[PDB]
Amino acid sequence: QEKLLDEAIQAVKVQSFQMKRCLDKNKLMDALKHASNMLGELRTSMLSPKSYYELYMAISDELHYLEVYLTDEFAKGRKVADLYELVQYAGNIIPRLYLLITVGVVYVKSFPQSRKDILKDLVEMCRGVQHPLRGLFLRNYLLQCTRNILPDEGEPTDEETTGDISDSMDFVLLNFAEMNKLWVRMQHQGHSRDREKRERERQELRILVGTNLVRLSQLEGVNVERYKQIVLTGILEQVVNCRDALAQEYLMECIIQVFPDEFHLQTLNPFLRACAELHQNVNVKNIIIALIDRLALFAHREDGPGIPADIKLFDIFSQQVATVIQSRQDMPSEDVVSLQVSLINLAMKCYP
Amino acid sequence: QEKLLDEAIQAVKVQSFQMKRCLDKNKLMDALKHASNMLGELRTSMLSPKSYYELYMAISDELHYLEVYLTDEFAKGRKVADLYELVQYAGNIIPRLYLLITVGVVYVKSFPQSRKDILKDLVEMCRGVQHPLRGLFLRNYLLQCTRNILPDEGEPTDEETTGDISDSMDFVLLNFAEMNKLWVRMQHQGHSRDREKRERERQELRILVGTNLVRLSQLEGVNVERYKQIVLTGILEQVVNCRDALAQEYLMECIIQVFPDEFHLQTLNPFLRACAELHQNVNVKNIIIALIDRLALFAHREDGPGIPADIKLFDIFSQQVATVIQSRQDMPSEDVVSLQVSLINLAMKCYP
Amino acid sequence: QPELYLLNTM
Amino acid sequence: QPELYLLNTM
Amino acid sequence: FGPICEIDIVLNDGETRKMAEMKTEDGKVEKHYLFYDGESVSGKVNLAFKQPGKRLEHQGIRIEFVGQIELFNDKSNTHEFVNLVKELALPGELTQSRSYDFEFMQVEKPYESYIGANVRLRYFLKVTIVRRLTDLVKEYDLIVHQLATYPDVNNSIKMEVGIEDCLHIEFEYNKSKYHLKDVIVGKIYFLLVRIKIQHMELQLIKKEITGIGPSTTTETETIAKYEIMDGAPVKGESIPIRLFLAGYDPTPTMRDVNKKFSVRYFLNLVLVDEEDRRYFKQQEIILWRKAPEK
Amino acid sequence: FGPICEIDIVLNDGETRKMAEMKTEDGKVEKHYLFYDGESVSGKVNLAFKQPGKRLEHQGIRIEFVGQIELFNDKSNTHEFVNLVKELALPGELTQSRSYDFEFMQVEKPYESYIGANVRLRYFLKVTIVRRLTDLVKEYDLIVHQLATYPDVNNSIKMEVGIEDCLHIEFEYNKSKYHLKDVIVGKIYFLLVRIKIQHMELQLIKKEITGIGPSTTTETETIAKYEIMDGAPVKGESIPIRLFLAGYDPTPTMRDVNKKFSVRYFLNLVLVDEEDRRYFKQQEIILWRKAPEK
Amino acid sequence: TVADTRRLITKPQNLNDAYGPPSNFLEIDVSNPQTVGVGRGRFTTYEIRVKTNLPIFKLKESTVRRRYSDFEWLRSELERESKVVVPPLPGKAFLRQLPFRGDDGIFDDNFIEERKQGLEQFINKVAGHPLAQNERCLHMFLQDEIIDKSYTPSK
Amino acid sequence: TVADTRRLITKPQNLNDAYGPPSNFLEIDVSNPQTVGVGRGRFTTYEIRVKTNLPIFKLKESTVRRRYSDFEWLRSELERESKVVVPPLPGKAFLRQLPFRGDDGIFDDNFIEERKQGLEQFINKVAGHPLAQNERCLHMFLQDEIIDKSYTPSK
């Protein structure tokens, strides 16, 4: 159809225009009424995934002018209390939650002391989320809002300001587990004949999921020991527990690519034992090859200590790939040989 | 008529029957209601002073049996307060005030602390009465009640008992002035054609008047020193100022009889200057002779100091009598000689 | 029947 | 028009 | 048959509470419970059901505390100055006996109870079982006394009155305001006596004034005749007065109660001459119920 | 001409006293003074005399404090639960303007003011100049709020409900009694889900029950619809509830006011399936006006 | 304290006032009835003897002769000016004037005696009255030897 | 404290329930319309293909052939025993049976297509209903190869 989209973007530009109009003229609740009717425009859903996405990104960009307005206002001290209650009068859950995230981040900036409490509230109340499309785009808005202000270690620690790196980690892992649940739930909603359409749409949205890991990676607090003890234990718990293949594989390559080999080296046998339990329909071969390629560029990457002698990569990887092959049932022997080729290259380049 | 009298004495005997009936059954207020009924009988005007006197003596002698009855109940510990208002319930003033006197003396015996106050009260509360006959009969009840409870030299000086000789003297001087006022008003009341009836009536009540002096004479506290300074000085001002002849003469005879020569020798001459201003119409010879007789029984009286030589009594009386005769208008010469005879007998027997 | 005369202030 | 079913206690 | 139901009220403090008496017409004396301005009235309405087998259909039961002023025995001229309601039962039935609690919190009772000639003021509890054509109603009378303290200002009455060149006197009563068991202490002083006085007496007179404006009815009643002199005075004579008010049991002075009625007391001094002519001077005194310590 | 006289009431504390608002028909909002059970009402009745030269003949002026319950806008069905009178003037005239003081001591106001569909409860001062054929009357409205403290017992509501072998849930609301600016904190826990649920919402429902016995009219009004889930849950899923009651401005729960009317609130939980069929469970909650510290 | 003995304090009575004669003395005697004239002219007069000490009466003692018509004139004057309820006279007996009765008519002794008492009754009431003593007619009657009916009523 | 963040505490969701497939699967397809008979006997049947995982349905997959009268019989049985407000059928079109119309009558394609959708509309509503799933007639219709109209309605 594609018309729905232009007509919708028209009405959107209308309400967000009258919204920003009311915000410069400094009669706030009227601006929030136009903002609310505008987000009402998001209550249509027939949009293409791409189209709906543009409307989403458009509205996010207009909301940014509001966020800086609020951030300034709070920095100016002009703060109205109890905003959540007044805003909960909006009859639908959607205005309430858009308002809660928006005001939450403003309070966190203005009240870093409130950061722990506000985050714990938001993380707990998001369990209400059950619909895939709006939930996905909301938790994306969450992920972008949470871009920088989350607790961190080299951060001033005012005992009014509560929350640490561990809290940020728990925050992102929880929102992740909920969003991945809805996203996999996307597999079975609608008629079973939209499966290729569904899987295409999810594939489109895979970046949304990986952005959580990107967010996890800028977290300065990520030491090797936190990586060892918290991150992988959480992720592998969901992975082993989800017993799906498309998501597990995407997320695991994104991990492979993203984290530094220093962390991976301390966590190889857990990561490879986890790799061995994965689903049979998985092309583990392409994963393993990518892995071999990364450790190969890591072996001949100089400006580094080289391979620690305690690190018997070949014996480790040999035994785990072997375990993976046992875990595999229908391996093309040619695939086994394609892996043997990379096994040559590794032994050749690391220990002639 | 004398019948009025008989009907009254029968109804009286009936009512005094109702007294003794109520006194038997301890119905005091029922007896006192009948006491009121007797005094209603006193509202008559037809009876003679003597007739009233006989009926009064009947009611008084029976009322004493009531008075001693009450006194005994009170002597039994059955003391009732608040008597002053209750006795005022009687419609007739006479029952109320008779009740006040009767219970008052009862309070005096039972409450010696109140004696002074109660006596001053009763003497002052007599201002209620203004009628000569009933007032007289009241004051007779007063005189018999106070015959014994008045202060004197032979009373116990009990630190609960209150009231002194000075109170008794003030009491009697007041009762004197009050009785003479009422009594003299009796002179001019009614028609002038009853001059012989009035003077006969006056003669009848004369004993009422003299009983007060009789009361003064049993008073041990009537000593010579009070008589000299205060008592006789007081009495002589009212006596000389009544400027009558019948009263002055009667009271003066009572004087002659009543006081001791102990009093007379220290007070003859003050008393004799008083004697000199008296009213013209009076027989004074009889006064003087009574005096002469008493001083004569003193001249030939043995076991006594006799006449001190410095006070030449005969020359004194001679000179005063001379002045009195000068004061007399036309007094028969035979009378002057009858006086000369006693002056002879006296000078011979007292100053041989 | 019986005469009744009010006493006046002076 | 739209069916309304009361939820029973267990 | 009889009545189907009998209403009886029983106050919670019906044992310990003090009662008081009221003189009604033909010398009758009623005795009801005593209450004071500010006190709470509370108790039980007990319905004795008399006809077993039968049923009582009603359109509601209530209890009312009522204080009102009745004029000339005229039902149309009753005026309620206090009314409080407690609904006891909704429309329904009664097969058997039942009781109902009630409490009226800290009840205002601005006036004292009074039964006069043309006026009644009474307080009562009125229980009403409402029925289709005829309500079962039960009244339950109470006495209210209004108390007061010793007055701020209390001046003696003193007055020189007379007939010109015939009689001059000076009377004095020790107060203007006397409590109900007080005493008139006074005196009569004679300044000029050119008439022949037989006797003198003090009278206590109670006027009860009813109505509004030109509509005014005064009912006078001579409560006391009290002789104070017997015989002719001369000038300079003083006659004492001591009249105990306890003897005559009067009411307090009640002035413009609800703008409806007054009850005032007067001291009428009366001298009587030899030909029975009668010279008098009236003086209002206020009476007041003294508060006993407690 | 106009009116000969205009009645105006002015309370003694008319500057400092707090006011409150009342939602009437067609969305109108009145503002009257606020009062509390036990408070004294006092002030001045000011009569503006408008026609100079003319005179106003009356048969008495009074002021009444009135609290009453009006049902179905039927004047014959009004019921006064509080009535106090202060007579201001006796029968007479008025040539010029005049004021009159009044005070009602420590006035009982047992109920809270309420304007509903078939019920009104209001307090007011009513001044009445009585005339021969037509009384000049002036009403003067007041709001009374009834306060309460934190309740002794307050148990959470928790309940396992469903359709057999189709839907089992366990809902929990954190209290039974919520103040007017309180918050419903709760959760919905799914035990068995064999239907396809589109969405779920909590509703706040206000029932107003009028009449007596079989005479019963209930007026229902759905005050809030509050979405709490969007999409299909599976078993083991918990959905959080946080509903701020401040947003909807309700009244307190008012139970058998004068045995005449109730006003009750209910939490109606509603799930809706893919074919729009609607599964629900109602739960009464008590609302109460919290007393602010002072 | 067992008895309430309260009185107000009094002024002592001056001894002249206390004993000296009272100032309310007033006695009027109607006495000595006498015929005056012969035949059809005849009428009875009485002696009205006054004794007093009230200052208002201009003679302390007086004696005058009065007719029953004079008593009617006094009563009639007092009914007009005085505003005193005046007591009754013993009565005009008209039919006693009629001739050939079984008694001496207007000069019957049981009549004249009974009338004489009634006039004494009347005059002592009237003369004792305070408002009556002001009026000129009463003094005119008691103490002027002849009444002047053509007078202007004063006081 | 600047934000009221109160929630009740929750029980962690067991990972089998969280990921494992939902227990509300039920899809019914009405498809493949076919004539059965020749001449005056002719009527259309449809394939009623069921897929589910609800325990109440005794086959997880089933396929049966149904006539529009059968759909009326199902609706009629449900109107008696069930006390479910039953949705409407797409309608008996009687006048389509009449001869010499301007269309193929009861076997018009715009008709059969539109009817086919209405039956799918109807059966998915009815079959999704909770109170309807108990009643024996619904299972009889969906999963027995022939309906036994002479039956005693149970459950």
Numbering used by the authors:
A (entry chain C), B (entry chain A): 12 to 363
C (entry chain N), D (entry chain H): 551 to 560
E (entry chain J), F (entry chain F): 8 to 301
G (entry chain L), H (entry chain G): 4 to 158
What does the paper behind this entry write?
The coat consists of arch-like units formed by VPS35 homodimerization that are directly connected to membrane-attached assemblies of VPS26 dimers and two SNX3 molecules contradicting recent assertions that the VPS35 arch is incompatible with SNX3 membrane binding and that retromer:SNX3 must therefore adopt a flat structure. VPS26 forms a homodimer on the membrane by β sheet complementation between the β7 strands of the N subdomains, creating an interface identical to that seen in the retromer:SNX-BAR coat. Several mutations in VPS26 (K93E and M112V/M112I) occur in sporadic and atypical Parkinson’s disease (PD) with an unknown causative mechanism. The coat assemblies described here place these mutations in close proximity to the VPS26 homodimerization interface where they will likely impair VPS26 dimerization and hence coat formation providing an explanation for the mutations’ pathophysiological effects. In the structure presented here, SNX3 binds the core trimer at the interface between VPS26 and VPS35. For both metazoan and fungal retromer:SNX3 coat reconstitutions, we included membrane-attached cargo peptides that contain a canonical Øx(L/M) sorting motif (where Ø is an aromatic amino acid and x is any residue).
Here, we elucidate the structural basis of membrane tubulation and coupled cargo recognition by metazoan and fungal retromer coats assembled with the non–Bin1/Amphiphysin/Rvs (BAR) sorting nexin SNX3 using cryo–electron tomography.
